[model samples]
Target: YPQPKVLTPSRKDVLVVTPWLAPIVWEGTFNIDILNEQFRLQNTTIGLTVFAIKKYVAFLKLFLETAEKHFMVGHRVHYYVFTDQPAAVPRVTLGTGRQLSVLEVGWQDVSMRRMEMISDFSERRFLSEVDYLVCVDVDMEFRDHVGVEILTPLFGTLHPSFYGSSREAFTYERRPQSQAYIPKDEGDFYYMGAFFGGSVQEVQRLTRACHQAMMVDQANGIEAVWHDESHLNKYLLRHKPTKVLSPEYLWDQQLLGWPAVLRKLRFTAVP
Candidate 1:
């Protein structure tokens, strides 16, 4: 490991830690070797859940393949891919301790319903099977290391587009009628829904809350501006996450070019 300079900070350009003192993970801020050993000692088994209904099933092969290459490598991993067309799941091979399970899901509503599904299944499956649950979108692939450094009780990845913007400019659900509403003056960070995870207990709590909120809004004939993402931002605002992942964890290089500040683009959209 490199020598540390007491006065020097790992990242100067971006806010490394949130106001509440939770670490905002970026490339240079952590040592994967140290983090890996810590989780390995605990015999951590990570369960990654992805929804691939409809056309999204096509992305699973590359998603799983690249995940095998980078996501929590060397640790036990169980990839839970929920899809309607389970037969379409590709035959991508995995590491010795890694396995993939295709769960058949019975709608962009599929998107919102995922919270419902996960909450229902969390009690039955994730709670008993894995130490941590990482819910991510299947439409992306891992480009660099995404390891145990992110395994916290609760975590949210900052929306790449809004990370550099002010609260007023954040695209939160602004309508007061919606359950996901966050006033113009109120917001910590805009968290994209594509990536978020925590201990099964916390993740289940979050999904259940979001699902219940969505149900309330639906009963009132309302929907948030960004659907689940809007609700996620609201949930995280009230109950701050233990860790905040930088946009590097969920980026689109095609949309936003390689900025000098991002030393590594860990996982990215497939364009």
Candidate 2:
């Protein structure tokens, strides 16, 4: 039997470092009038959204279970659980006392598209108060060693999105005709998958840009050739990301020919 409960709810002193521009940080030099308003209460908010296949119960549980680790770091996180058909899945729930919002997704859009809508919602409805916004997948497991360091300073590097593990695709390749399967000598776009995190403002911008580019690709029937990675690569090339994180953040279990490097990033506690 499985149980659903709230993990953490207090937003006392957690660090909110992403690009979200809002109650977390004061916006604009021109708004002297609005500047006088209460900004202290706005900085503690955090938003995390998951667009998982509703049927993949394993992934959904993994996403929530892993995030429980972050709560221990003393941050208040707001989870937006998005599903293809909200009613189709079990009662969507997180730990007690934590603020969890459920957003119903329609049957028409793809995974990437659902994420875009979440981003839009965050900016329009929640960014004004959130300190950071994390884009996560339901499949990612939150190991004990992973912490805030894995999620911060996203826009500081050439690719703020954590680079993908240099491994075989995580899932059973579904679309054989896809370009990702074709494998050009130039190498496939960073295999990091869709996992990305950023400051509220930085992420809002990146999300919008990536989504627009993807729509263009889809319009031309180029999604089969490019997919989200293709558009992300193009965007990253033009506008360097503000942060770059290690591939361990998106670590996978399989690597066809690459040597194992998890030990290289090992963290040992003094016993």
Candidate 3:
């Protein structure tokens, strides 16, 4: 694994993915310079969030290096690293001289199912200080020159994202009986699990509502077969986001093949 390299400090912001699991590449692709350039064009900031267990230090190091390859080290970004068991290992340092803010979150009292929120909540809570927030899964990676621009169309959308490639392709119905069910013809477009948007207030409203709804269902013993994904799906359907994003922005890179090689191979004629 590679370590973080030097980067200049600036105000561009990015939201990091947060997960508590064994380290795996986020699709192992590299076209981040392209993506960063896009953000630079628009003059925006980017940051990341990571979570780990004690035994997973190796995974953390590997994960951070891989992430830095795309979104962290070289740019002015923040990493909201979460962990129940933190290591003495040196925290990831960015070239911008902006240090990561390590926030301590606990799962002891919360239901194990709520684990996803550590990332979502942290990102949102921190987002009040920025213009946009992107909630990416630790397992997903970007492949194109388009970074947050991929989400520009979703700005101001009431329910900007969903799961799957299209509305019908959405898998929120994970189980048969959840209230988040959508009839065959209702889906507007495919909904992948990842999402990006403009409003911190709007996102907080929607996310909290969905979690509350899920908690209510859990108390009633009405479990949605798939989990949080189901809640998010139903939330989008009911609210009908102001803008809906294209699935092309958040694709399943692995579906094409294993050991996927994703990068932009541009060329210029040799003089």
Candidate 4:
């Protein structure tokens, strides 16, 4: 690992740490070899959860194949695919120490149901099966290394489009009537719903809270402005994650062209 320069910022242009002092993970902020060694020493097992209900089963092949090449390589990984059609799950061959399990489930309100299912499974299986639970949307691919550097206790990715915007301009749920509400003056970064994770306990707690909040809103005849993402931001704001990932971890290169600032686009929305 290289030595840190006391006089310079990890990223001179970007705010490398949050106001609460949590490291905002970026391309230059870490040495993966170092982090990898530390986690591997503990014999960590990561449980990755993805929901591919209905037509989404079409994305399973590419998603799994790309993940095999980059995500948590050289470490233990257990992929739990929650899909409506188990038979449709593509037979993507996995490397040793990496395995995939198909867990069938009963949408894009889908965004909300994911929380309910992940929360339920957290207790039923995640706690004992793995050290961390990474919950993600299924329509994505890993284009670069997205390894142990991302496996923190509680972490969220900065949305691709909103990272440079002011807090007021963020599309947080402004309606006080909704459980995901966040006043105009309050917010750190707009976190994407596509990728997020943590230790089993923290991930479980977050999913459970988000699930319950969505139910409250539904009962009151209202849905959060951005559904589950609204609740995710709300929860991360109050809870303050230990790490905040840069948009490099969750990008849509087709929707937003690759800018020079992004040195590596790791996990991204499949176009």
Candidates' lDDT values, in order?
Answer: 0.91, 0.47, 0.45, 0.89
For model 2, residues 115-141, the per-residue Cα lDDT tens digits are 478557757754576666766656556
Span of ten consecutive residues with least summed lDDT in model 3: 262-271
TM-scores for every predicted model: 0.97, 0.61, 0.59, 0.96
Q: What is the lDDT of residue 79 in candidate 4?
A: 95
lDDT of 2 at 158: 15
lDDT per residue, candidate 4, 1-88, as tens digits? 6888889777876778889998888888888889989999999999999988878888988889999999899999999999889999
Winner on lDDT (3 vs 4): 4
| Between candidates 1 and 4, the TM-score winner | 1
The predicted structure with the larger lDDT, 2 or 4, is 4
In order of lDDT, best first, we have 1, 4, 2, 3
> Compared with the true structure, what per-residue lDDT tens digits does model 1 show for residues 1-271?
7787879988889888899999999988888888888999999999999999889898998899899999998999998888999999999988899988888888346547889988887778435858889999999999999999999999999999988998999999999999999999898999999999999899989999999999898889887888988999999999999999999899999999999989999999999
Lowest-lDDT window of 10 residues in candidate 1? Answer: 105-114
Clashing pairs in 1: 107-110
Deviating ranges (above 4 Å) for candidate 4: 107-111
The stretch of ten residues in a row with the least summed lDDT in candidate 4 is 104-113
What 10-residue stretch in candidate 2 is worst by lDDT?
21-30
Choose 1 or 2, whichever is better by TM-score: 1
